[PDB]
Each structure stands twice: as C-alpha cells, then as structure tokens.
Amino acid sequence: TWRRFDVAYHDPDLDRLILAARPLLSESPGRSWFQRHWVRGPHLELWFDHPEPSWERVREVLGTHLRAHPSRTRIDPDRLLPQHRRLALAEQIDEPLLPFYDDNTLHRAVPRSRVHVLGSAAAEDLFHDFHAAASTAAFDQLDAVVAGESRLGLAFELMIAAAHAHAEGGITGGFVSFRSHAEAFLAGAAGLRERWEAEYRTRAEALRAQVAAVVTGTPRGRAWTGLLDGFAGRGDELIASGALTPDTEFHRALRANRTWHDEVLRSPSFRRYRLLLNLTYLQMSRLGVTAVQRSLLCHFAASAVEEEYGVSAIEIAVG
C-alpha cells in the first residue's frame, strides 16, 4: 500500500530540505507524510499511499534543491555503524544498515512495518493517519523555525497544550508526566540536572508566562489540541481491545503510591493522554528536536508548571 523515498542529507538541519518537499505532500490525493531517520545514515523519508507524486516528480522537485543547497556535513561511518547496530536492536529494525547512502542523493526505498512494536495493523494505520495530518502542520511550524522562531519554543507550546487539553486534571495533572520523563532520562545525572535547573532559572519568567498563555488559549495551542482530538476515539478503542500496546527518587516514590497503580496507570484517561503525548513527541522529532532536547523541555515544563501553580510533581508522586 505505501511508497517510500529516502533523501540522504547528512547535515542534521533538514528544515530547508523539508520545506522544498512541501509541494510533493500538498499537491495530490492520498495520505503523505515525512519523518527523519538514521538507517543507511541520516536521511529524510517521504511516504505516500497513492501513486502520485511519481519518482520522476520527486526528482524534479528535490534534485533541484539538492543541487542548490547541498549538505556539507561529512559523516563518520566507522563511528556510526556500531551506534546504528545498537539502535537497530533497541528499535527492532531489521533492514540492512549498510552501505551508508552517499550525501545529497535520492533513493526509492522499501516501506518498513512497525506492527510488531505498535501491536496491530490497525494501530499502525492510526499512526500513519497521525503522521499524514501532523506532517501538514509541520510545514507551517518549520516555516516559522527557518524564518527564525525558536524550535524549542514551538515544541514547548505543543507539550503544554497537550497536557492542559488531554490530561485528566489539565495542566496540574498532566505535568507530572513531564517530570517523570525528565527524571527517567537523567538517570541520576545530578550535574546535568543542575545545568538544566540553572538555565531554567534564566527562562522562568518567560516560560511561566508561556504556560499561562497556552492554558488561556493560543491559536497554535488550540490547533495542535484540535489535531490530537481526531485520534482520541480510535486510540481509546485500540487501547481497550489490546490492538495498541527507573531507580530514581521520583520513580521509587511512584511505585509505592497506590493511587498511581489504581487510579492513574491503568485508567483509560491516562492511557489516552500518554498516547497523545507520545504523538506530540513524534511531532517534536519531525521538527528536529532531539531526545536530549525533548527531555530538557520536559524538565522546563514541569518546573514552569510548578512555579506558576505552586505545585510539586515529586510531592504528588510521594502521596
């Protein structure tokens, strides 16, 4: 059902290349979407379930761009291969990892299946529907970033909006997830945590204001939560049928808290929230936000909500 094209582009800043692809994902019927990926080296993937654009049309648009604005980053294959072998085990990727693509090249590629990770073809199809809708939204987000808006700031707004609209209890409920994710990432890194805290202090006033603005309602926040709304029903149904599948002070506390077990973890509302937050994190990846940066945002979001509302995620976890 799907066609895939890989654009090998070794500079981590894909944003202009993505914007050049906008007509290909905007001009013909069918679902189309893009993501960033690492197999055979850094590359952009374009996915289509209908027969247009053709390979020839894809080359007409993106060949022109690669010749005008080529990547000048050089990969280090010797260091990348072992990293990719580990990623492949972790992400359950069975595709060949070699040879690495040459920089600034276009390829047809074989679409991969994620059923074994997501739980069913129906769950995979729902993620494809999300990607199709979200990729359209991403072009406007990336136009803003290229134009000079803060990438992390746009992502922060998506996260706050998702927690306020889609968590039970709104922002002062959903923010506990942000702490959880930051503390799981940090895995005992006191020195990194202190660096994050010190940067957060410089940002606090602006970040608290952004939290209050998003909670009041912003056009971007409402647009993102509107998009997420489209997946809530089907998501609840796949979660309920089974079709959609840390040693830290915080997580130790949580594991001893019976409300976590009985009213949070197993609740359909938390499962739904967590699905829609995970879709938000996928969007952040599409927008070029790395795993460390997503985890920093989680730290900043939790800290901002705590300061604005005078609440404490660790106190909630302890119970």
Ligand X SMILES: NCc1nc(-c2nc(-c3nc(-c4nc(C(=O)O)cs4)ccc3-c3nc(C(=O)O)cs3)cs2)cs1
CB of 115 to ligand X, least distance (A): 24
Q: Phi and psi of 269, rounded to 5°?
A: -70, -40
* 260 binds ligand X, rule: CB under 6 A: yes
Residue 127 and residue 238 in contact, taking contact as beta carbons nearer than 8 Å: no
Stretch that binds ligand X, among 12-20, 150-158, 194-202, 259-267 (CB under 6 A): 259-267
Q: Which of 73, 83, 259, 290 binds ligand X (CB under 6 A)?
A: 259
Q: Which of 53, 173, 221, 235 binds ligand X (CB under 6 A)?
A: 173
Stretch that binds ligand X, among 43-51, 101-109, 123-131, 258-266 (CB under 6 A): 258-266
The amino acid that residue 161 corresponds to is A
How many residues in the shown chain lie near ligand X by CB under 6 A? 16
- String of DSSP letters for 242-269: TS----SHHHHHHHT-HHIIIIIIT-HH
The amino acid that residue 73 corresponds to is T
Residue 162 and residue 174 in contact, taking contact as beta carbons nearer than 8 Å: yes
Q: How far, in Å, are 135, 165, 180, 218, 288 from residue 300 at the CA level?
A: 26, 19, 12, 19, 18
Q: Which of 168, 223, 234, 312 binds ligand X (CB under 6 A)?
A: 168
Q: How far, in Å, are 166, 210, 300 from residue 179 at the CA level?
A: 17, 18, 9
Residue nearest ligand X by beta-carbon distance = 169
Stretch that binds ligand X, among 20-28, 237-245, 284-292, 311-319 (CB under 6 A): 311-319
Q: Which is nearer to ligand X, 18 or 254 (CB)?
A: 254
Which residues of the shown chain bind ligand X in the complex (CB under 6 A)? 168-169, 173, 176-177, 180-181, 254, 257, 259-260, 264, 274, 316-317, 319
